[PDB]
Design an enzyme around this catalytic site. Structure first.
Site, mmCIF file in Angstrom:
data_model
loop_
_atom_site.group_PDB
_atom_site.id
_atom_site.type_symbol
_atom_site.label_atom_id
_atom_site.label_comp_id
_atom_site.label_asym_id
_atom_site.label_seq_id
_atom_site.Cartn_x
_atom_site.Cartn_y
_atom_site.Cartn_z
ATOM 1 N N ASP A 1 -0.954 9.050 16.150
ATOM 2 C CA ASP A 1 -1.662 8.769 14.873
ATOM 3 C C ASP A 1 -2.498 7.494 14.998
ATOM 4 O OD1 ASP A 1 -2.499 9.136 12.262
ATOM 5 O OD2 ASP A 1 -0.656 8.313 11.376
ATOM 6 N N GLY B 1 4.792 7.814 2.156
ATOM 7 C CA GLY B 1 5.607 6.749 1.556
ATOM 8 C C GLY B 1 4.800 5.514 1.248
ATOM 9 N N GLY C 1 0.818 -1.218 0.000
ATOM 10 C CA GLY C 1 0.000 0.000 0.000
ATOM 11 C C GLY C 1 0.840 1.250 0.000
ATOM 12 N N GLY D 1 0.824 5.229 1.792
ATOM 13 C CA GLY D 1 0.354 6.262 2.728
ATOM 14 C C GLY D 1 0.598 7.641 2.149
#
Ligand SMILES: Nc1ncnc2c1ncn2[C@@H]1O[C@H](COP(=O)(O)OP(=O)(O)O)[C@@H](O)[C@H]1O
Ligand SMILES: [Mg+2]
Length: 450
Positions: free
Chosen positions: A304, A197, A192, A194
């Site tokens: 986060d 990165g 995946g 983000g």
């Protein structure tokens, strides 16, 4: 001099470690509390570093396949309730109720409860003998298991199958492996993307499967990264994703435990995920709360916390990922808690307004994460754009109870969203609440007096 026995096969990753097979006998230079021991094989005579969690003293209880040590009742049930396990699948563990005592945990079936786990306390007498019932006593746990492996003799069922153990991760990739060469990593499968990165499944030194996060140059100071990474390195818990290694030079690579079922967010909006029942969702909430209670005990801050940063393993294991990193983002917008890349919908007002990130602003984030868990991963504040969220929440707006969320879980969310950070519950309380969410009048253990 102690002879150790290998609990699992270990394949050599370096020039200085030692390969061995399960059952192989080993002696070590020092019984340190370190993660890697300098050993030689009594079989091969070869010398090298071994992961300390791959061995146990020969003829120790810890050497037995069915002995799972300090595993909790909940985590034992997670393993035992796997649908591949036959009736009578079992393990032995330390009691968490009674010091120095043990527990036999056995998978059972009846039409009354369907698939369920029976827990029997094994009393150890001060005189040294072990028993579930005072009338049938044993000189050792080995003899107790050998016996009930032949006759149920009061147990729900005979002991048929040793609970299968997933081969454990080593602590670190190798002795003193931390700042690693880029060329030691191969990026195989992109998992995946983000905001800052990409994440790849890949290999360290050819054969060790790891996750590799690659940060765009300029994302964070390599200096600040390495200082924070020394703090992050010290965080060790069953419900945190292990940080294995770093490539300190830009582009920065962050090497972590590969989690094969991906993010909780994608899981919830998936095939297994979208049909999960409340008790499964509460168990995942309780696992996340336990990881964050560890973060809390360690005086650390996630910064986060959201479903995207929970990763899922086998048996609905949930681990906290990407803790600490958000502080090191250099982006001026992000630093100002502004722009398309900042998770304002998960951010406590005092963190967004003043940059006061604390364990209490992580508690706020956890409440928002509970809405994701109870809405199959629906975006928080569905009808609102990011630019209008802080204004609403500062005015005292709070998301209402999701349609399939029980009021009691909504009340917990509202406590997480107290205006005053000090009024929000601890992760210690959140974990205790979610672990005991459902009450039963059922006997905790099966009474030994029959
Ligand atoms: N340790 C990991 N193991 C497996 N997949 C991972 C891991 N970390 C991240 N991923 C995958 O990479 C994706 C992107 O992660 P990341 O770059 O942190 O972005 P974000 O947290 O914003 O989703 C995640 O959704 C997940 O699919
Ligand atoms: Mg992430």
């Amino acid at each position: 001099v102690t002879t150790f026995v290998a609990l699992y096969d270990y394949e050599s990753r370096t020039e200085t470690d030692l390969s061995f097979k399960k059952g192989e006998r080993l002696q070590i230079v020092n019984n340190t509390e370190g993660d890697w021991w300098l050993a030689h094989s009594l079989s091969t005579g070869q010398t090298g570093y071994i992961p300390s969690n791959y061995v146990a003293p020969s003829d120790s209880i810890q050497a037995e396949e069915w002995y799972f040590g300090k595993i909790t009742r909940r985590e034992s049930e997670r393993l035992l309730l796997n649908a591949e396990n036959p009736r009578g699948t079992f393990l032995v563990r330390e009691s968490e109720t009674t010091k120095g005592a043990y527990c036999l945990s056995v998978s059972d079936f009846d039409n009354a409860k369907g698939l369920n786990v029976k827990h029997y306390k094994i009393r150890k007498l001060d005189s040294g003998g072990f028993y579930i019932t005072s009338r049938t006593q044993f000189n050792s746990l080995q003899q107790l298991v050998a016996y009930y492996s032949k006759h149920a003799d009061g147990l729900c069922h005979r002991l048929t199958t040793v609970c299968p153990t997933s081969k454990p991760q080593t602590q670190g990739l190798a002795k003193d492996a931390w700042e690693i060469p880029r060329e030691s990593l191969r990026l195989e499968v992109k998992l995946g993307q983000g905001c800052f990165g990409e994440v790849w499944m890949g290999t360290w030194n050819g054969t060790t499967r790891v996750a590799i996060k690659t940060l765009k140059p300029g994302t964070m100071s390599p200096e600040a990264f390495l200082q924070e990474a020394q703090v992050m390195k010290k965080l060790r818990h069953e419900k945190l994703v292990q940080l294995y290694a770093v490539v300190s030079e830009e582009p920065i690579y962050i090497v972590t435990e590969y989690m094969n079922k991906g993010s909780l967010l994608d899981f919830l909006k998936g095939e297994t995920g979208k049909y999960l029942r409340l008790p499964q969702l509460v168990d995942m909430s309780a696992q996340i709360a336990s990881g964050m209670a560890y973060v809390e005990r360690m005086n650390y801050v996630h910064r986060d916390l959201r479903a995207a940063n929970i990763l899922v393993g086998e048996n609905l294991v949930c681990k906290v990922a990407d803790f600490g990193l958000a502080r090191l983002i250099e982006d001026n917008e992000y630093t100002a808690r502004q722009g398309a890349k900042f998770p304002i919908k998960w951010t406590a007002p005092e963190a967004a307004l003043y940059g006061r990130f604390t364990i209490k602003s992580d508690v706020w984030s956890f409440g928002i994460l509970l809405t994701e868990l109870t809405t199959k991963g629906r975006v928080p504040y569905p009808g609102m754009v990011n630019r209008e969220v802080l204004d609403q929440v500062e005015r005292g707006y709070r998301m209402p109870c999701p349609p399939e969320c029980p009021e009691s879980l909504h009340d917990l969310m509202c406590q997480c969203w107290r205006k005053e950070p000090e009024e929000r519950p601890t992760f210690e309380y959140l974990q205790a609440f979610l672990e005991d969410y459902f009450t039963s009048t059922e006997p905790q253990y099966q009474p030994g007096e029959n």
